[PDB]
DNA sequence: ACAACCTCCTTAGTACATGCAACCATTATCACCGCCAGAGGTAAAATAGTCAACACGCACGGTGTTAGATATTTATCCCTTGCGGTGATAGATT
């Protein structure tokens, strides 16, 4: 179920048709929208630029977000779910980039 | 000599458990009315004071002007959308 969900549920969009301009006729409203930034130290774990369900396999340990993430030290870093290949290999180094470290 | 036994005698000892809702009456009955207490009343003076007078003196509030803030307008910027290209996932195996 950690795979079978971002599109599995975005089946949605083949049941909208009903409801949504059933018709030819959009609209002006609007969509309201919810931002909070770079770098802030509460910002997701995709704020490092990520590998495929890499980002849904690593966010499921509840290490949601960046500022946690510097604890975790190549001595103890695996507790994760699966996170197996190119996201674990060398992405440590660009996390310095937008400016994190470990140590 | 007493013993309990036959009969219907009467006595009277009890009657399971949990909970919620409602409001608090009926009596008549001379208390007499006489006396006098300290004890109610109030006049005149203690324990002390009112508020009107003429002064005193101040605060507050509303009218006026000023200040600056705010909500508008404008326009800029970024973060987000949705699709797409193609990603190393998921997890089976080494």
Same mark, same amino acid.
């Given at each position: 179920?950690?795979?079978?969900?971002?599109?599995?549920?975005?089946?949605?969009?083949?049941?909208?048709? *009903?409801?949504?301009?059933?018709? $030819?006729?959009?609209?002006? !409203?609007?969509?309201?929208?919810?931002? !909070?930034?770079?770098?802030?130290?509460?910002?997701?774990? $995709? $704020?490092?630029?990520?590998?495929?369900?890499? *980002? =849904?396999?690593?966010?499921?340990? *509840?290490?949601?977000?960046? /500022?946690?993430? +510097?604890?975790?030290?190549? +001595?103890?870093?695996?507790?994760?779910? =699966?996170? /197996?290949?190119?996201?674990?290999?060398?992405?440590?180094? +660009?996390? *310095?980039?937008? /400016?994190?470290?470990?140590?």
């Amino acid at each position: 179920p950690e795979e079978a969900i971002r599109r599995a549920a975005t089946i949605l969009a083949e049941q909208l048709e *009903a409801f949504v301009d059933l018709r $030819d006729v959009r609209q002006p !409203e609007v969509k309201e929208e919810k931002p !909070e930034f770079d770098p802030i130290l509460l910002l997701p774990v $995709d $704020d490092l630029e990520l590998t495929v369900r890499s *980002a =849904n396999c690593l966010k499921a340990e *509840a290490i949601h977000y960046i /500022g946690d993430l +510097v604890q975790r030290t190549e +001595v103890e870093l695996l507790k994760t779910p =699966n996170l /197996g290949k190119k996201s674990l290999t060398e992405i440590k180094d +660009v996390l *310095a980039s937008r /400016g994190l470290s470990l140590g």
